[PDB]
Amino acid sequence: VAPTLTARLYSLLFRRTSTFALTIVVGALFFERAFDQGADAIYEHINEGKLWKHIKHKYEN
Amino acid sequence: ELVDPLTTVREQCEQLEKCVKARERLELCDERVSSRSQTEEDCTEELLDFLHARDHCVAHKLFNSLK
Amino acid sequence: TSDTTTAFSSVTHICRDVNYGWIIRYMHANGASMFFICLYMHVGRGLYYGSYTF
Amino acid sequence: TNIRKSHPLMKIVNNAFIDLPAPSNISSWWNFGSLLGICLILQILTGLFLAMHYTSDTTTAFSSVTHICRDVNYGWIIRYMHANGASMFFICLYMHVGRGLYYGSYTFLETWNIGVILLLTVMATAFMGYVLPWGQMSFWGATVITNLLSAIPYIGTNLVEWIWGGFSVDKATLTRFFAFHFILPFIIMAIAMVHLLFLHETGSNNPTGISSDVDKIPFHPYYTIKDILGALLLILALMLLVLFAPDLLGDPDNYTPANPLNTPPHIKPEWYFLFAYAILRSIPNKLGGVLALAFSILILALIPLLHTSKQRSMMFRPLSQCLFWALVADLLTLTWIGGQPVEHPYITIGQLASVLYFLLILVLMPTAGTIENKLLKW
Amino acid sequence: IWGGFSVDKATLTRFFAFHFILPFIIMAIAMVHLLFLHETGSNNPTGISSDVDK
Amino acid sequence: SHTDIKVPDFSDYRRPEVLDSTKSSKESSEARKGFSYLVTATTTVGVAY
Amino acid sequence: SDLELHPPSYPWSHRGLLSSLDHTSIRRGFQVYKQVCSSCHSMDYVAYRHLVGVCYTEDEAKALAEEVEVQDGPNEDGEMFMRPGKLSDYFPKPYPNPEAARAANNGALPPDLSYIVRARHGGEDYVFSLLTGYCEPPTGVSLREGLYFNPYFPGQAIGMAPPIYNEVLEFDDGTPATMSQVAKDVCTFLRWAAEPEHDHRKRMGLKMLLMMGLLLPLVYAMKRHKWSVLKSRKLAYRPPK
Amino acid sequence: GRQFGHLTRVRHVITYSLSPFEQRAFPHYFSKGIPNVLRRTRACILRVAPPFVAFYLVYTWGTQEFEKSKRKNPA
Ligand SMILES: CCCCCCCCCCCCCCCCC[C@@H](O)O[C@H](CO[C@H](O)CCCCCCCCCCCCCCC)COP(=O)(O)OCC[N+](C)(C)C
Ligand code: HEC
Numbered sequence: 001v002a003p004t005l006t007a008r009l010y011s012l013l014f015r016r017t018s019t020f021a022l023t024i025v026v027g028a029l030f031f032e033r034a035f036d037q038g039a040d041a042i043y044e045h046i047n048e049g050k051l052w053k054h055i056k057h058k059y060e061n
Numbered sequence: 062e063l064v065d066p067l068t069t070v071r072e073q074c075e076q077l078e079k080c081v082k083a084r085e086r087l088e089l090c091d092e093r094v095s096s097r098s099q100t101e102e103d104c105t106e107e108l109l110d111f112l113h114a115r116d117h118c119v120a121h122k123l124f125n126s127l128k
Numbered sequence: 129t130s131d132t133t134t135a136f137s138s139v140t141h142i143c144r145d146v147n148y149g150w151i152i153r154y155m156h157a158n159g160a161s162m163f164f165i166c167l168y169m170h171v172g173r174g175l176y177y178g179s180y181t182f
Numbered sequence: 183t184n185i186r187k188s189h190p191l192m193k194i195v196n197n198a199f200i201d202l203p204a205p206s207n208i209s210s211w212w213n214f215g216s217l218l219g220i221c222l223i224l225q226i227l228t229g230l231f232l233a234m235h236y237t238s239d240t241t242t243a244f245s246s247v248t249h250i251c252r253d254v255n256y257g258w259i260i261r262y263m264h265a266n267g268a269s270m271f272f273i274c275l276y277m278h279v280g281r282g283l284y285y286g287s288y289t290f291l292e293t294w295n296i297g298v299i300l301l302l303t304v305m306a307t308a309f310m311g312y313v314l315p316w317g318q319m320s321f322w323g324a325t326v327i328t329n330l331l332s333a334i335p336y337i338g339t340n341l342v343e344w345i346w347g348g349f350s351v352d353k354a355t356l357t358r359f360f361a362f363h364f365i366l367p368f369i370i371m372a373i374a375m376v377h378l379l380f381l382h383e384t385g386s387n388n389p390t391g392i393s394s395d396v397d398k399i400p401f402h403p404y405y406t407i408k409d410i411l412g413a414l415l416l417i418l419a420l421m422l423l424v425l426f427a428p429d430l431l432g433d434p435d436n437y438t439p440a441n442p443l444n445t446p447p448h449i450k451p452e453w454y455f456l457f458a459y460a461i462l463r464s465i466p467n468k469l470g471g472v473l474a475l476a477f478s479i480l481i482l483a484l485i486p487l488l489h490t491s492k493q494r495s496m497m498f499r500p501l502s503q504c505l506f507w508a509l510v511a512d513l514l515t516l517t518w519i520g521g522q523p524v525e526h527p528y529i530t531i532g533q534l535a536s537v538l539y540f541l542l543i544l545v546l547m548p549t550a551g552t553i554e555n556k557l558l559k560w
Numbered sequence: 561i562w563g564g565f566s567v568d569k570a571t572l573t574r575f576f577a578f579h580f581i582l583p584f585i586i587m588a589i590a591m592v593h594l595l596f597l598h599e600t601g602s603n604n605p606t607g608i609s610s611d612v613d614k
Numbered sequence: 615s616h617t618d619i620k621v622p623d624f625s626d627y628r629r630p631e632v633l634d635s636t637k638s639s640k641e642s643s644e645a646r647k648g649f650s651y652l653v654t655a656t657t658t659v660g661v662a663y
Numbered sequence: 664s665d666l667e668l669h670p671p672s673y674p675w676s677h678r679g680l681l682s683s684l685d686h687t688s689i690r691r692g693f694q695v696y697k698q699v700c701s702s703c704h705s706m707d708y709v710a711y712r713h714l715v716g717v718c719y720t721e722d723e724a725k726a727l728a729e730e731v732e733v734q735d736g737p738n739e740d741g742e743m744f745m746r747p748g749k750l751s752d753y754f755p756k757p758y759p760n761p762e763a764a765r766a767a768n769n770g771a772l773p774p775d776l777s778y779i780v781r782a783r784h785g786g787e788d789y790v791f792s793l794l795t796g797y798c799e800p801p802t803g804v805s806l807r808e809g810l811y812f813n814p815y816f817p818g819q820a821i822g823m824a825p826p827i828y829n830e831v832l833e834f835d836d837g838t839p840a841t842m843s844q845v846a847k848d849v850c851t852f853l854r855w856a857a858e859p860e861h862d863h864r865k866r867m868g869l870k871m872l873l874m875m876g877l878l879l880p881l882v883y884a885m886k887r888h889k890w891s892v893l894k895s896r897k898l899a900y901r902p903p904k
Numbered sequence: 905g906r907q908f909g910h911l912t913r914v915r916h917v918i919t920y921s922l923s924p925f926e927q928r929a930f931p932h933y934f935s936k937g938i939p940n941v942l943r944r945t946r947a948c949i950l951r952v953a954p955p956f957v958a959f960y961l962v963y964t965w966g967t968q969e970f971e972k973s974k975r976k977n978p979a
């Protein structure tokens with residue numbers, strides 16, 4: 001964090017509206033993965049075994 | 062044979078401060094409708110008052126050890 | 129009505145049972161193509177007269 | 183020179199949403215105008231996607247609604263987005279009219295009277311809306327309201343039967359109500375753009391009621407971003423209501439199909455009709471009941487003729503502030519009472535509040551303004 | 561566009577909704593049509609400008 | 615007389631990277647735009663989802 | 664009588680402010696409809712395919728479907744035949760028309776059971792309270808013997824005879840079939856057979872709350888910085904002479 | 905409609921503004937905001953609260969008078 005990470009993020013990506021856009025769309029794709037299942041994992045913990053995804057192996061051929 | 066959790070914990074509910082109090086006014090209504098000639102001052106009212114105090118307690122503990 | 133079961137019948141219901149429904153129904157059906165003759169006249173005129181330059 | 187200023191389409195947008203001279207000091211209370219526009223559009227997009235799978239006949243009306251929720255992919259959200267957006271649209275309407283009273287905005291005659299017509303139309307819409315599921319409340323609510331029109335002197339019965347398509351709220355009425363409920367939000371939108379035309383002829387009012395020509399700021403970016411933030415809050419309030427409590431505002435009777443014989447014990451409007459239902463039920467007479475319900479809303483068209491104050495806003499008017507909140511708290515009373523049966527404590531205070539609504543607007547607040555003028559030696 | 565694997569139940573009702581809305585969008589697009597037009601006024605049979613005889 | 619017009623002191627509002635009158639703002643312009651543009655980029659990313 | 668009594672608030676595994684349905688107990692409750700309330704109670708809006716992925720697997724659901732005769736569409740001959748149950752079949756209609764419900768179920772008409780925890784005030788707590796809170800008539804009032812007695816019923820009397828007594832079936836996977844258990848499970852099934860989307864909305868609602876928690880401070884920050892040019896502006900009036 | 909440069913006549917008012925990138929979005933958010941919010945509340949409590957209290961007590965009495973009416977006490 002030598003000339004600040006935000007400063008280098010500005011000069012490398014935020015300056016031109018093109019690389020600013022590209023950072024958002026690349027970022028929107030990364031974030032969608034880390035959030036969808038990342039929030040699903042928190043939804044798992046409040047319903048530890050009362051979901052069908054946990055029951056699964058009880059009725060298997 | 063067959064141990065129902067409702068009636069097991071309902072006995073703890075019937076034995077509560079505000080609960081017996083509502084059975085006292087139910088009984089005094091009982092021994093007045095039965096005692097008099099041909100009234101219509103019936104005890105559907107006092108019945109519901111007891112069940113109000115009783116079933117409030119029922120909900121608090123009922124679900125603790127239900128499989 | 130919008131369902132398969134009643135779509136065809138409601139259309140008939142209009143023509144047969146609904147007061148002056150038959151006129152409304154045919155006014156629509158014929159107006160649809162009357163709308164097309166005007167569209168065709170109007171586009172044609174645009175070509176002929178160079179109106180398209182707008 | 184500037185493309186954004188001189189193009190016969192971009193020019194019209196620029197002068198309404200971008201370069202518009204707006205007051206520097208408009209409250210969060212000014213957000214409801216845009217939030218209404220969001221609400222109107224939201225109802226259109228959920229409405230259409232609902233109209234795609236919904237049927238208009240008695241035989242299939244209730245079932246198609248279920249079909250949407252159960253079978254149609256993400257149909258349950260679209261359905262509840264609609265139902266909750268309907269009343270979200272009403273909270274914004276109520277905030278917006280209230281703000282108009284408080285701040286003296288009504289002095290813009292044309293733009294205000296158009297807004298009254300917007301209100302009647304959005305309410306005429308929602309009343310036709312709730313009938314469509316064909317639940318018990320759909321039918322009997324439809325029955326209770328329509329039957330009132332039998333009271334109009336010589337013209338009475340012929341009118342109600344004409345709106346009915348028969349002698350009761352029947353087969354004809356459902357489908358007919360659907361057609362009117364499809365078209366009315368579009369007419370609403372057209373009337374809403376004239377509303378915005380008349381408005382832009384003066385620009386906005388502000389909290390002070392003094393003219394803001396000496397301190398105008400451009401609608402972008404200040405009000406673009408203030409409306410962006412405000413819309414995020416609307417989605418929060420609409421989505422908490424949809425993803426956690428989709429029936430909190432909803433009546434359970436509407437979850438059983440309509441029965442024209444078996445009439446339910448309570449006849450409960452959706453909350454946004456409760457104050458008006460109260461005003462109507464309070465008066466015993468048939469003709470008078472409807473004429474009081476009518477008067478309950480058309481009264482807003484009188485408020486400008488009954489501006490008595492030398493100042494525009496209530497901001498510097500303490501007596502008028504108290505009389506305003508009396509009107510809000512009184513309207514809160516009419517609401518609660520409307521959702522109650524016509525038994526002992528409720529007949530009296532419900533009738534009493536009714537008199538107060540009218541005495542407050544027609545007499546009390548016009549007097550406060552005269553006194554308030556006199557205290558300033560004006 | 562089908563709501564399935566053929567022109568089914570879904571398609572009728574869906575087509576109805578689109579057929580209700582589209583004439584209103586038509587009207588809105590028709591008023592812009594008239595806006596752009598009034599910016600020049602009408603053309604005439606000759607194709608010469610009529611500013612000298614309006 | 616127009617020479618009396620000094621700009622009111624802004625220290626109360628100034629971002630800390632630009633509180634020093636003897637310090638060049640250019641040193642911190644990069645980092646300062648960075649923060650406010652990151653907020654925006656993150657916002658759009660959230661809206662996009 | 665007209666005067667009422669309301670259900671308490673039994674602490675269900677799904678009426679928590681964000682919590683999903685108990686999937687093991689949606690299963691048990693299906694059975695409590697299957698050989699008990701299927702003989703007087705319609706469930707017209709729940710099909711067999713709906714049970715898949717929720718409580719049972721693909722095979723189990725088909726296996727339960729095949730258990731009864733369904734009137735299938737007309738053959739080539741022109742008469743309606745009867746076939747084993749498929750996955751896409753609706754839940755069996757006990758009465759051909761609600762008028763047959765009147766004559767063959769002790770005067771009164773039993774209501775449709777899909778959407779039951781949403782059509783009665785208080786919801787599942789009410790149905791649990793009506794099912795579990797059965798008692799003997801009070802003094803002064805005589806129940807007309809073509810009608811029973813329940814305190815939770817609005818009119819106190821009327822209609823339904825109660826099959827909620829201990830063990831009307833043995834539960835598939837090691838579970839004691841008591842009164843409070845057999846009443847709980849139906850309700851935990853009827854919640855699902857009124858609002859199936861329950862879990863999804865709550866899953867989405869969490870995502871909405873987490874999204875707003877990130878978005879609301881960030882948009883506010885966008886607004887403030889834009890508005891800051893105005894919020895720190897200094898005025899000075901310098902009139903002449 | 906009206907546009908800038910045509911709104912009204914204004915003479916002798918200097919305005920000093922700062923760039924948003926030069927300043928902080930929340931200068932003293934809690935140290936000034938909280939003093940302000942109470943000040944704002946105190947300014948209006950005697951003007952907004954009294955009808956709501958009056959409603960609340962009518963609501964609480966009215967509902968208490970509703971239930972305590974249909975039940976009897978003699979024959
Ligand atoms: C109408 C009903 C809906 C209600 C919606 C209400 C909810 C609010 C959400 C509304 C959206 C508001 C967006 C938030 C405003 C942020 C401003 C944003 O638009 O950025 C602007 C510029 O826009 C972006 O740069 C564009 C980025 C594009 C990112 C992609 C977006 C996702 C769309 C996917 C595109 C693919 C098309 C789809 C094909 C199928 C200006 O940026 P600025 O803060 O001034 O910074 C200046 C730029 N610098 C740094 C270079 C100096
Ligand atoms: C199996 C465990 C069930 C469940 C969950 C329910 N029933 Fe019945 N029921 C029957 C009749 C004739 C009535 C009508 C009585 C009246 O006039 O109200 C009912 C009523 C219901 C209700 C509605 C009551 C209410 O909530 O207001 C509910 C929720 C309900 N039942 C659930 C008849 C039968 C029957 C044949 C005699 C059997 C078997 C069942 N019921 C079993 C069940």
Ligand code: HEC
Pocket residue numbers: 211212213214215216218219222275278279282285287288290293294295296297298299300301304370374377378381385386387388482
């Ligand atoms: C008669 C009550 C009335 C109703 C109802 C009403 N309007 Fe308004 N509206 C007004 C008035 C008066 C103003 C002027 C407010 C001002 O500038 O202070 C206004 C302002 C607005 C604004 C500008 C932003 C603002 O809030 O000042 C918009 C946008 C708006 N109205 C749209 C709508 C929409 C959409 C509807 C719902 C169809 C509607 N209004 C309902 C009377 C109302």
Ligand code: HEC
Pocket residue numbers: 167170171174177179180182586590593594597601602603604
């Ligand atoms: C691209 C073909 C085209 C179509 C299709 C078309 N317009 Fe036009 N329209 C034009 C042009 C070009 C003109 C200019 C004609 C001129 O002035 O000579 C015009 C002129 C008109 C005029 C002015 C009167 C006149 O005839 O010059 C009206 C009104 C009109 N259009 C409305 C409509 C309506 C309504 C529709 C159906 C929705 C429509 N038009 C369809 C291109 C067309």
Ligand code: HEC
Pocket residue numbers: 222225226229230231232233236247261264265268271304307308309311312313314315363364365366367368370
């Ligand atoms: C595309 C036509 C369409 C538009 C536009 C429309 N809706 Fe609806 N709305 C429907 C249909 C279809 C239903 C019935 C399905 C349902 O209940 O979800 C309905 C349902 C309703 C309901 C009953 C809610 C419920 O589920 O209990 C209300 C209330 C309502 N709409 C109000 C409105 C309002 C207010 C507007 C905006 C002025 C509007 N709608 C816009 C077609 C429309």
Ligand SMILES: CO/C(=C/C(N)=O)[C@H](C)[C@H](/C=C/c1csc(-c2csc([C@@H](C)/C=C/C=C/C(C)C)n2)n1)OC
Pocket residue numbers: 302303305306308309310312313319320322323324326327449450451452453455456458459475476479
């Ligand atoms: C369809 O029924 C219902 C709908 C609902 N959304 O609550 C309620 C259950 C019902 C309605 C109550 C109610 C009260 S008050 C009202 C209403 C309907 S309509 C209207 C007037 C003011 C509007 C007239 C518009 C006329 C234009 C066409 C010119 N007021 N409806 O309760 C009986």
